[PDB]
Amino acid sequence: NEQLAKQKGCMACHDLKAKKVGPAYADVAKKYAGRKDAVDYLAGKIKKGGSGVWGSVPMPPQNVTDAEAKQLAQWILSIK
Ligand code: HEC
């Protein structure tokens, strides 16, 4: 956990409690913490990228698979 975001380099904009170029993973988690499919949705935009729900900066695409996409929404959501 955690070390994963490094191998990818998502912190370049995201941030647990630091609203930087991207919505702090902690903030997004709470926003999707009251949901039940935050895993599919998130990962759905993780392998696609883009934007429109938090801003416009088309986040750069990534090379992850469904499984990896799950750990991202599961690891980012658990973060508060
Ligand atoms: C800055 C260039 C970014 C880097 C690097 C990464 N992400 Fe990102 N991400 C960024 C923004 C600005 C947004 C919001 C765009 C919008 O308006 O919606 C996002 C969003 C995500 C999301 C949300 C998916 C969703 O809710 O549909 C996820 C899951 C996400 N980003 C994952 C992610 C990962 C895994 C990264 C490293 C591989 C990563 N992002 C880098 C900006 C940036």
UniProtKB/Swiss-Prot annotation:
Keyword terms, alphabetized: Electron transport, Heme, Iron, Metal-binding, Signal, Transport
Protein name per the record: Cytochrome c-552
Family note: Belongs to the cytochrome c family.
Its job: Reacts with hydrogenase.
PTM comment, free text: Binds 1 heme c group covalently per subunit.
GO MF, one example: electron transfer activity
Residues that bind heme c: C10, C13, H14, M59
